[PDB]
């Protein structure tokens, strides 16, 4: 019936409210009358569904089966694992709503097309999963340990190793003597009496891993947690810094390789496979409305009374300048004819609100009336609005997914965590925020370590399944939108070898250079020579030829010439020279002009940029509106005072009595200039949570922040992320859519793969025997394949039969070789896994497609490297003297990431590019004339790195996409 449809959707949605209120802390029932009422509600719903199923047992087939399955579980449940099962109850609804029968059907129909991509992932997880366990097995456990003969006195109460101030986040991991770790022993700080830190010489294994028990490399189970965290690019750096302490500094290659293979090449390959499968008077008012809005953006905490008053007066004059047009438009036009054109209705509503807090805030709707004068924006907005219908279903589908997972997360770890941590799963409202948080991947791993250490280490499957299937229904969204769009002489070379030699001097520069040594003397008179050569080169092109690229080349030579004529005048200022040095780091840009392949790509990006250029203005407009709106809400609010106590304190007048310092948060909403930076850490999606917390804690202009003072401010930040993400998605879509217009042997190998995963840390003697004994078997069978007779297989066996020989020689043959030679050889048995590459015909076809499009990518890749060269060089100049001793604490920069070289400033620029804690880096370049420069350097780098990385993905998409079309 049409009315049989609503009896079901009444009791399915009645079910959710009985799941919505869980109150997990209050376990074992009988808490209140309401709890009993909720229990009573359950019986009615369960009784009704069984009866409904029976009516249908009197009479989508797949969907019908699912309803029966949930019902059977419910009956069994009535007869704590069973209790969590209830959550599935909400899934009955997918069949009920038609708009979801279809979407889900498509989702479920795409999985057999991701057969190949999934297969590729296993190779990546397995290959890097074993190389981790071969190398860093139980390496993380070690700590400085006493020399174990002498026991310290009872009175001192020291632990027995070196504990840091926070042993859960940053333990002190010493490096074994047989290894070369960065953090060697005896580097421990003097104790704050006798200093016991001077007696921590021995370094040996300890019971606990670095983050709770979670970050660890001593099973194949615990390696795949850490590989999954590197691939999701969240907190990946923390892992690499522990490896570099325990086992050398050359371990960075493993991580970089993992990231440009697992994290970029593979995660953005299941976007490619999933989408290739489908295939005069009015001109005066425009000046008036702009200067009204710009009149709003001049707030700024602590403005003088002469300015607040002027602004108030200004508002009054403007209102009459809009009212008397309304009066004019109500007299030169008729009253009925005024209403009919629909923008004239809206422009009169703003007048009535103006004449008559919320009203004060509302003034920001006055920019809206400007779209009556822009034809292009008017057309653009409608197109954007058209996509909402397609988007609404997925969002509706997404809501069910968050609800289910926020309900499930209450059952597993509801009241286990930690006062409790802010990201906790108890109260529902803070469970849906935590599940929305993991879907933006921002500190999803800080919740993992509370999750794994509270229930069990098998609780990573809750977070693997929330991140995977949350990101799988978000890749579909891009594709669904995307599909709809588809249905509507030698001179150049010779001078190039002078620039690449020019780069080496730029790279060489660092602040720790003596003014009189030979590194200094070489850099001064290589400046003279290069400038002269370039200067000579410039005339040749102008006495012969008598253009955009040339001016850039021309400007650079002039700047260099000017630099010498202030460097000569050094005796006779400093400020001009500093500006020149930064400008002098733009020398690398010359390379683009010389290379034709590279040159075309740079021009091409600009042309590609134009179609979505218009949308950017709309996106830009939103930042200003939320920038002004944001400023009004928290002008004096982000003043948090730091001390050791931070209790019994409410005011600046109280926090000065105890002598605690007052800290204005680095990211605050004081000006429109600061609010526009703090809305870039929100938009970036990194560190948005840590901004959001003090936006919820914000109380008053001179007050101390109260935790969770106003949880209604979640609407200011969560709603901002869902329209930044929406706008960014549209821009990506716009750019793409305009371009268009045996069987024994394999089994034997499989058996071998399982055996290599058997190894762990402190495996017993017999499994060390059996594993070794087993190897002697698989060595024989692969020779028996080369008897029975591809080039790689011959090479593969050679490594094997070589390995058995080396290991054996050491025990009873002769003097051993160095252990390092043996260890490398053991790893090289992983090459046997590559042979099953041949069996997978499908993976190779999918894989080659990337190669065909590789040449376009190569130019982009070259461009990406050039951009790190300019920024890295630039970075060293600005941030050379930042340091991190005990007197200067630093948040993002540290021992492993500094800007004091060109090498260390090249690794530091890589984790800004992946997006891991770059706001902690920008937070402490500010901590010491740097307030304007430092946000320009970190905002313009991120928007130009991510924009090159987008143009790679859409270039791999196009070549791959074209294959499907020919058929
Ligand atoms: C794709 C499927 C691949 C399946 C591979 C299965 C390999 C199993 C290896 C194994 O059995 O590991 C034994 C190890 C023992 O650990 P434990 O008992 O703590 O140590 C005793 C001595 N200290 O304990 C472990 O290593 C457990 C590893 C579990 C990995 C499960 C992964 C499931 C998929 C996610
Ligand atoms: C497509 C189909 C989609 C179906 C979705 C179905 C959703 C049903 C949700 C029902 C929620 C009932 C919640 C009843 C309740 O008492 O929960 C309290 C919770 C928090 O409210 P509050 O009083 O502010 O408590 C603060 C401390 N937790 O209340 C809340 O704040 C919950 C807010 C939920 C907002 C969801 C996003 C909009
Ligand atoms: C209006 C709602 C529009 C939702 C659009 C979602 C979207 O297109 O995705 C953008 C963004 C991508 O996030 P993700 O791929 O997980 O990577 C995060 C890296 N920090 O995804 C997000 O920002 C999270 C979106 C979650 C949406 C939940 C449903 C809200 C209704
Ligand atoms: C659009 C979404 C609108 C959601 C509306 C939820 C309304 C919840 C509600 O009515 O709560 C009332 C409650 C009253 O508070 P009060 O009278 O002071 O009592 C305090 C002691 N309980 O209010 C409170 O005490 C605090 C209520 C906070 C509700 C904030 C909701 C934010 C939703 C963010 C969703 C994030 C994305 C999810 C996907
Ligand atoms: C939609 C439903 C919105 C319902 C909002 C209800 C807000 C409310 O109940 O009033 C209090 C709240 C906080 O005001 P305040 O008094 O400054 O806070 C405590 C100071 N001791 O009043 C507020 O000022 C909080 C306003 C929160 C909403 C932010 C706007 C989001 C805009 C999204 C656009 C898309
Ligand atoms: C697939 C087959 C890949 C085969 C890779 C073989 C690597 C063998 C490494 C053994 C290292 C053993 C060791 O104890 O390392 C110590 C070493 C000390 O530093 P060292 O450079 O020797 O300093 C000079 C001292 N006189 O410190 C080091 O140098 C450590 C170097 C680690 C390098 C790791 C490279 C990993 C590459 C994995 C590629 C996977 C590709 C997957 C594609 C899909
Ligand atoms: C693939 C193979 C890659 C091999 C790269 C070898 C780089 C060797 C760097 C080095 O030896 O150290 C100097 C410098 C910083 O090293 P530092 O931390 O000062 O010293 C630690 C050990 N004494 O080295 C560093 O800055 C570390 C990273 C340097 C990366 C330079 C990359 C230049 C362009 C790369 C294009 C690709
Ligand atoms: C995003 C682009 C397209 C436009 C960016 C415009 C901003 C750079 C403008 C808008 C109004 C300006 C602000 C107007 C009021 C002042 C208060 C002023 O207060 C003080 O610091 C006084 C003491 C001192 O300056 O030393 C600081 C600069 C500031 C925030 C200005 C900073 C630059 C602002 C934010
Ligand atoms: C709209 C697109 C480009 C997304 C990114 C926009 C912003 C992230 C960009 C646009 C121009 C940038 C701003 C250019 C001028 C400066 C002024 C500067 O103002 C001050 O710090 C004055 C000192 C004080 O306020 O105390 C703060 C950074 C800021 C706002 C920059 C912050 C980052 C901005 C806002
Ligand atoms: C071991 O103990 C002896 C005394 O039995 C002591 O002389 C020696 O210093 C100790 N060694 C270490 C490394 O602590
Ligand atoms: C260091 O401590 C470990 C564990 O207590 C022990 O095995 C080792 O022999 C100690 N080394 C020295 C030199 O005492
Ligand atoms: C804070 O005040 C409470 C009473 O309001 C008191 O019990 C507590 O000792 C105070 N805390 C400190 C740091 O003294
Ligand atoms: C802050 O000072 C104390 C805080 O304990 C209190 O008297 C008052 O509420 C606040 N304002 C003052 C006193 O200036
Ligand atoms: C290796 O040889 C030595 C002497 O040649 C002998 O003592 C030892 O037992 C041999 N190893 C094994 C495992 O038999
Ligand atoms: Ca991230
Ligand atoms: Ca992060």
Mind giving me the DSSP string for 863-919?
HHHHHHHHHHHHHHHHSSS---SSSS--SS--SSS-SSSSSHHHHHHHHHHHTSSHH
Query: Are 894 and 937 within 8 A, CB to CB?
Result: no
Question: How far apart (Å, rounded) are the C-alpha atoms in residues 515 and 517?
Answer: 6
Secondary structure percentages of the chain, helix, strand, coil, to 5 = 70, 0, 30
Query: Are 266 and 120 within 8 A, CB to CB?
Result: yes
Q: What residues does ligand 9 touch, defined as CB less than 6 Å away?
A: 620, 623, 671, 673-674, 676-677, 680, 931-932, 935, 939
Beta-ladder partners of 858: none
CA distance between the termini of the chain: 45
Pocket test for ligand 3, best of 234, 722, 732, 916 (most atoms within 8 A of CB): 722
| Cα dist from 300 to 37, 306, 620, 629, whole Å | 53, 13, 21, 12
Q: Residue 462 is encoded by which pair of tokens?
A: 């809750």
Query: 584-599 as b/e, with b when 16 or more CB fall inside 10 Å?
Result: bbebbbbbbbbbeebe
Which one of the ligands is nearest to 823 CA?
Answer: 6
Query: Are 694 and 667 within 8 A, CB to CB?
Result: no
* Nearest CA among 266, 263, 279, 273 for reference residue 115: 273
Q: Cα of 901 to ligand 7 centre, how many Å? A: 10
Q: In degrees to the nearest 10, what's the CA dihedral of 446, 449, 454, 455?
A: 110
Q: How far is CA 481 from the centre of its chain?
A: 23
Which one of the ligands is nearest to 698 CA?
Answer: 5
| Cα dist from 341 to 369, 716, 753, whole Å | 14, 33, 72
Q: Which DSSP letter does residue 835 get?
A: G
Pocket test for ligand 6, best of 246, 827, 843 (most atoms within 8 A of CB): 827
Question: How far apart (Å, rounded) are the C-alpha atoms in residues 239 and 686?
Answer: 18
Q: Taking the CA atoms of 770, 771, 777 and 779 in sequence, report the sign of the dihedral they define.
A: negative
The CATH number of domain 595-741, selected from 1.10.287.70, 3.40.1410.10, 2.70.240.10, 3.30.70.100: 1.10.287.70
Question: How far apart (Å, rounded) are the C-alpha atoms in residues 930 and 578?
Answer: 13
Q: What residues does ligand 6 touch, defined as CB less than 6 Å away?
A: 123-124, 127, 131, 180, 248, 250-251, 253-254, 257, 261, 820, 823-824, 827-828, 830-831
Pocket test for ligand 7, best of 251, 903, 905 (most atoms within 8 A of CB): 903
Q: Residue 720 is encoded by which pair of tokens?
A: 């901002």
SS (H, E, C) 273-312: HHHHCCCCHHHHHHHHHHHHHHHHCCCCCCCCHHHHHHHH
Q: Give 159's contacts (C-beta < 8 A, 6+ positions apart).
A: none
Protein residue whose Cα sits closest to atom 33 of ligand 2: 429
Beta-ladder partners of 662: 641
Question: How far apart (Å, rounded) are the C-alpha atoms in residues 508 and 282?
Answer: 59
* Residue in the block written with tokens 């008017």: 378
* Nearest CA among 567, 541, 566, 565 for reference residue 553: 541
Protein residue whose Cα sits closest to atom 5 of ligand 10: 149
Question: How far apart (Å, rounded) are the C-alpha atoms in residues 798 and 160?
Answer: 49
Domain boundaries, the chain: 4-89, 115-269, 283-372, 386-483, 491-594, 595-741, 743-838
* Residue in the block written with tokens 């307030």: 931
Q: Residue 392 is encoded by which pair of tokens?
A: 């609404």
Ligand 4 atom with the shortest distance to the CA of 432: 38
Q: Is the domain covering 491-594 a CATH 1.20.1440.230 domain?
A: no
Q: Which segments of 59-89 does DSSP mark as H helices, in order?
A: 61-78, 81-84
Q: Residue 417 is encoded by which pair of tokens?
A: 């965590």
Q: Give 361's contacts (C-beta < 8 A, 6+ positions apart).
A: 629, 632
Q: Cα of 338 to ligand 9 centre, how many Å? A: 42
For 662, phi and psi rounded to 5 degrees? -105, 130
* Nearest CA among 675, 272, 662, 232 for reference residue 482: 272
Burial of residue 456 (CB within 10 Å: 0-12, 13-18, 19+) is exposed
712 lines ligand 5 (CB under 6 A): yes
What is the tally of helices (H) and strands (E) in the chain? 41, 4
* Nearest CA among 384, 407, 435, 299 for reference residue 718: 435
Burial of residue 332 (CB within 10 Å: 0-12, 13-18, 19+) is exposed
Q: Cα of 704 to ligand 6 centre, how many Å? A: 52
Query: Are 289 and 370 within 8 A, CB to CB?
Result: yes
Three-class SS state of 161: strand
Q: Taking the CA atoms of 751, 756, 762 and 766 in sequence, report the sign of the dihedral they define.
A: positive
Pocket test for ligand 12, best of 643, 644, 646, 648 (most atoms within 8 A of CB): 648
Question: How far apart (Å, rounded) are the C-alpha atoms in residues 361 and 634?
Answer: 13
Question: How far apart (Å, rounded) are the C-alpha atoms in residues 350 and 362?
Answer: 9
Instruction: Give domain 283-372's CATH superfamily.
Output: Voltage-gated potassium channels. Chain C (1.20.120.350)
* Residue in the block written with tokens 């296993």: 122
Query: Are 351 and 323 within 8 A, CB to CB?
Result: yes
Q: What is the resolution of the experimental data for this entry, in Å?
A: 3.3
Q: What residues does ligand 13 touch, defined as CB less than 6 Å away?
A: 650-651, 653-654
Class of domain 743-838: mainly alpha
Detail the DSSP E strand segments found in 775-834: none
Which one of the ligands is nearest to 467 CA?
Answer: 3
Query: Are 832 and 127 within 8 A, CB to CB?
Result: no
* Nearest CA among 118, 170, 41, 88 for reference residue 889: 170
| Cα dist from 173 to 2, 188, 317, 587, 897, whole Å | 67, 11, 67, 42, 18
358 lines ligand 5 (CB under 6 A): no
Query: Are 88 and 70 within 8 A, CB to CB?
Result: yes
Protein residue whose Cα sits closest to atom 30 of ligand 7: 903
Question: How far apart (Å, rounded) are the C-alpha atoms in residues 701 and 651?
Answer: 9
Q: Residue 849 is encoded by which pair of tokens?
A: 């497609």
Query: Are 297 and 624 within 8 A, CB to CB?
Result: yes
| Cα dist from 384 to 379, 390, 924, whole Å | 9, 11, 39
Protein residue whose Cα sits closest to atom 19 of ligand 9: 673
148 lines ligand 11 (CB under 6 A): yes
Question: How far apart (Å, rounded) are the C-alpha atoms in residues 960 and 967?
Answer: 13
DSSP string for residues in 622-689: HHHHHHHHHHHHTSS--EEEE-S---S--BHHHHTTTTPEEEE-SS--SSHHHHHHHHHHHHHTSSHH
Experimental method: cryo-EM
Query: Are 638 and 694 within 8 A, CB to CB?
Result: yes
Angle, vertex CA 25, rays to CA 22 and CA 26, nearest 5: 75
| Cα dist from 324 to 31, 290, 328, 332, 578, whole Å | 64, 18, 6, 12, 54
Which helix (H) or strand (E) segment is 752 a member of? helix 743-756
Question: How far apart (Å, rounded) are the C-alpha atoms in residues 535 and 523?
Answer: 18
Q: How many other CB atoms sit within 10 Å of the CB of residue 725?
A: 14
Question: How far apart (Å, rounded) are the C-alpha atoms in residues 436 and 461?
Answer: 17
Query: Are 354 and 365 within 8 A, CB to CB?
Result: no
Q: Taking the CA atoms of 92, 95, 97 and 99 in sequence, report the sign of the dihedral they define.
A: positive
* Residue in the block written with tokens 């606990």: 208
Query: Are 683 and 724 within 8 A, CB to CB?
Result: yes
Question: How far apart (Å, rounded) are the C-alpha atoms in residues 33 and 684?
Answer: 47
Query: Are 185 and 203 within 8 A, CB to CB?
Result: yes
Query: Are 391 and 481 within 8 A, CB to CB?
Result: yes
Ligand 7 atom with the shortest distance to the CA of 902: 26
* Residue in the block written with tokens 């250079």: 513
Q: Is the domain covering 386-483 a CATH 3.40.50.300 domain?
A: no
Protein residue whose Cα sits closest to atom 12 of ligand 5: 712
For 209, phi and psi rounded to 5 degrees? -75, 160
Which helix (H) or strand (E) segment is 613 a member of? helix 613-633
* Nearest CA among 469, 956, 508 for reference residue 739: 956
145 lines ligand 11 (CB under 6 A): yes
Three-class SS state of 175: coil
Q: Cα of 604 to ligand 5 centre, how many Å? A: 46
Question: How far apart (Å, rounded) are the C-alpha atoms in residues 566 and 583?
Answer: 14
Burial of residue 634 (CB within 10 Å: 0-12, 13-18, 19+) is buried
Do the domains at 283-372 and 743-838 have one common CATH topology? yes
Q: Cα of 672 to ligand 8 centre, how many Å? A: 7
* Residue in the block written with tokens 């069990």: 456
Q: How big is the chain by its Cα radius of gyration, in Å? A: 33
Q: Residue 494 is encoded by which pair of tokens?
A: 């010779």
Q: What residues does ligand 10 touch, defined as CB less than 6 Å away?
A: 147, 149-150
Q: Cα of 585 to ligand 4 centre, how many Å? A: 53
11 lines ligand 2 (CB under 6 A): no
Q: Residue 429 is encoded by which pair of tokens?
A: 């409202």
Pocket test for ligand 12, best of 647, 650, 655, 657 (most atoms within 8 A of CB): 647
Question: How far apart (Å, rounded) are the C-alpha atoms in residues 867 and 801?
Answer: 46
Q: Residue 703 is encoded by which pair of tokens?
A: 């007050």
Query: Are 413 and 426 within 8 A, CB to CB?
Result: no
* Residue in the block written with tokens 């025997």: 769
* Nearest CA among 667, 682, 672, 642 for reference residue 934: 667
Query: Are 633 and 713 within 8 A, CB to CB?
Result: yes
Three-class SS state of 552: helix
| Cα dist from 830 to 130, 749, 807, whole Å | 8, 11, 17
Question: How far apart (Å, rounded) are the C-alpha atoms in residues 577 and 210?
Answer: 47
| Cα dist from 750 to 437, 657, 755, 835, whole Å | 39, 70, 9, 11
For 467, phi and psi rounded to 5 degrees? -75, -35
Q: What residues does ligand 4 touch, defined as CB less than 6 Å away?
A: 402, 432, 436, 711-712, 714-715, 718
Q: Cα of 464 to ligand 3 centre, how many Å? A: 17
Query: Are 223 and 242 within 8 A, CB to CB?
Result: no
DSSP string for residues in 194-249: --GGGG--EEE--S--SSTTTS--SSHHHHHHHHHHHHTTSSHHHHHHHHHHHS-S
Q: Residue 208 is encoded by which pair of tokens?
A: 């606990």
Question: How far apart (Å, rounded) are the C-alpha atoms in residues 62 and 75?
Answer: 21
* Residue in the block written with tokens 């800007």: 899
């Amino acid at each position: 019936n049409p009315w049989f449809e609503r009896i079901s959707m009444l009791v399915i949605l009645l079910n959710c409210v009985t799941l919505g209120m869980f109150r997990p802390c209050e376990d074992i029932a009988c808490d209140s009358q309401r709890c009993r009422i909720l229990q009573a509600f359950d019986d009615f719903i369960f009784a009704f569904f069984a009866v409904e199923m029976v009516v249908k047992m009197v009479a989508g087939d797949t969907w019908n089966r699912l309803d029966f399955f949930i019902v059977i579980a419910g009956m069994l449940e009535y007869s704590s694992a069973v209790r969590t099962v209830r959550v599935l109850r909400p899934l009955r609804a997918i069949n009920r709503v038609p708009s979801m029968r279809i979407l889900v059907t498509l989702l479920l129909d795409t999985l057999p097309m991701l057969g190949n991509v999934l297969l590729l992932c296993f190779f990546v997880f397995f290959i890097f999963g074993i190389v981790g366990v071969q190398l860093w097995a139980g390496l993380l456990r070690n700590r400085c340990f006493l020399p174990e003969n002498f026991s310290l006195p009872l009175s001192v109460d020291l632990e027995r190793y070196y504990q840091t101030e926070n042993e859960d986040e940053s333990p002190f991991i010493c490096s074994q003597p047989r290894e070369n770790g960065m953090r060697s022993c005896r580097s421990v700080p003097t104790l704050r009496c006798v200093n016991w830190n001077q007696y921590y010489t021995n370094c040996s294994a300890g019971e606990h891993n670095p983050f709770k028990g979670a970050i660890n490399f001593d099973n194949i189970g615990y390696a795949w947690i850490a590989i999954f965290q590197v691939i999701t690019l969240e907190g990946w750096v923390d892992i690499m810094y522990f490896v570099m302490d325990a086992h050398s500094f050359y371990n960075f290659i493993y991580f970089i390789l993992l990231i440009i293979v697992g994290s970029f090449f593979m995660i953005n390959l299941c976007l490619v496979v999933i989408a290739t499968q489908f295939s005069y008077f009015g001109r005066g008012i425009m000046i008036a409305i702009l200067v009204n809005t710009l009149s709003m953006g001049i707030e700024y905490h602590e403005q003088p009374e002469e300015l607040t008053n002027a602004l108030e007066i200004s508002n009054i004059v403007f209102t009459s300048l809009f009212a008397l047009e309304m009066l004019l438009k109500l007299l030169v036009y008729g009253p009925f004819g005024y209403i009919k054109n629909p923008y004239n209705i809206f422009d009169g509503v703003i007048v009535v609100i103006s004449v008559w807090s919320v009203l004060r805030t509302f003034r920001l709707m006055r920019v809206l009336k400007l779209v009556r004068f822009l034809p292009a924006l008017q057309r653009q907005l409608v197109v954007l609005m058209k996509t909402m219908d397609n988007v609404a279903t997925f969002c509706m589908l997404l809501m069910l997914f968050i609800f289910i997972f926020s309900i499930l997360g209450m059952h597993l770890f509801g009241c286990k965590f930690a006062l409790p941590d802010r990201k906790n799963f108890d109260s529902l409202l803070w469970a849906i925020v935590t599940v929305f948080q993991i879907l933006t991947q921002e500190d999803w791993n800080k919740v993992l370590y509370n999750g794994m250490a509270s229930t069990s280490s098998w609780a990573a499957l809750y977070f693997i399944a929330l991140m995977t299937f949350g990101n799988y229904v978000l890749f579909n969204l891009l594709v669904a939108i995307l599909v709809e769009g588809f249905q509507a002489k030698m001179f150049d070379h010779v001078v190039l070898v002078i620039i690449f030699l020019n780069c080496i001097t730029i790279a060489m520069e660092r602040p720790k250079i003596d003014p009189h040594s030979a590194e200094r003397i070489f850099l001064t008179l290589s400046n003279y020579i290069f400038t002269a050569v370039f200067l000579a080169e410039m005339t040749v092109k102008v006495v012969a030829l008598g253009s955009s690229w040339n001016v850039l080349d021309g400007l650079l030579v002039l700047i260099s010439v000017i630099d010498i004529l202030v460097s000569m005048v050094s005796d006779s200022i400093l400020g001009m020279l500093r500006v020149l040095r930064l400008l002098r780091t733009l020398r690398p840009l010359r390379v683009i002009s010389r290379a034709q392949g590279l040159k075309l790509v740079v021009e091409t990006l600009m042309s590609s940029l134009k179609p979505i250029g218009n949308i950017v203005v709309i996106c830009c407009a939103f930042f200003i509106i939320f920038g002004i709106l944001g400023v009004q809400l928290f002008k004096g609010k982000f003043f948090v005072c730091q001390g050791e106590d931070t209790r019994n304190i409410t005011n600046k007048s109280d926090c000065a009595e105890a002598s605690y310092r007052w800290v204005r948060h680095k990211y605050n909403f004081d000006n429109l200039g600061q609010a526009l930076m703090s809305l870039f850490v929100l938009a970036s999606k990194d560190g948005w949570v840590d901004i959001m917390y003090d936006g919820l804690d914000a109380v008053g202009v001179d007050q101390q922040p109260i935790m969770n003072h106003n949880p209604w401010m979640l609407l200011y930040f969560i709603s901002f992320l869902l329209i930044v993400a929406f706008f960014v998605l549209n821009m990506f879509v716009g750019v793409v859519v305009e371009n268009f217009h045996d069987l024994f042997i394999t089994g034997v190998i499989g058996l071998n793969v399982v055996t290599m995963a058997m190894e762990h840390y402190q495996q017993p003697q017999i499994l060390d025997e059996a594993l070794k004994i087993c190897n002697y078997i698989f060595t024989v069978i692969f020779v028996l394949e080369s008897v029975f007779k591809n080039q790689l297989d011959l090479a593969i066996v050679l490594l094997s039969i070589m390995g058995i020989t080396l290991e054996e020689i050491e025990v009873n043959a002769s003097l051993p070789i160095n252990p390092t030679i043996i260890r490398i050889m053991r790893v090289l048995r992983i090459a046997r896994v590559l042979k099953l590459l041949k069996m997978a015909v499908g993976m190779r076809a999918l894989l080659d497609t990337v190669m065909q499009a590789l040449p376009q990518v190569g130019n982009l890749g070259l461009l990406f490297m050039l951009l790190f060269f300019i920024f890295a060089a630039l970075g060293v100049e600005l941030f050379g003297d930042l340091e991190c001793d005990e007197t200067h604490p630093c948040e993002g920069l540290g021992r492993h990431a500094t800007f004091r070289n060109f090498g260390m400033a090249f690794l530091t620029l890589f984790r800004v590019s992946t997006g891991d804690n770059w706001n902690g880096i920008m937070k402490d370049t500010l901590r010491d004339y740097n307030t304007v420069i430092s946000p320009i350097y970190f905002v313009s780098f991120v928007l130009t790195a991510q924009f090159v990385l987008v143009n790679v993905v859409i270039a791999v998409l196009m070549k791959h996409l074209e294959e499907s079309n020919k058929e």
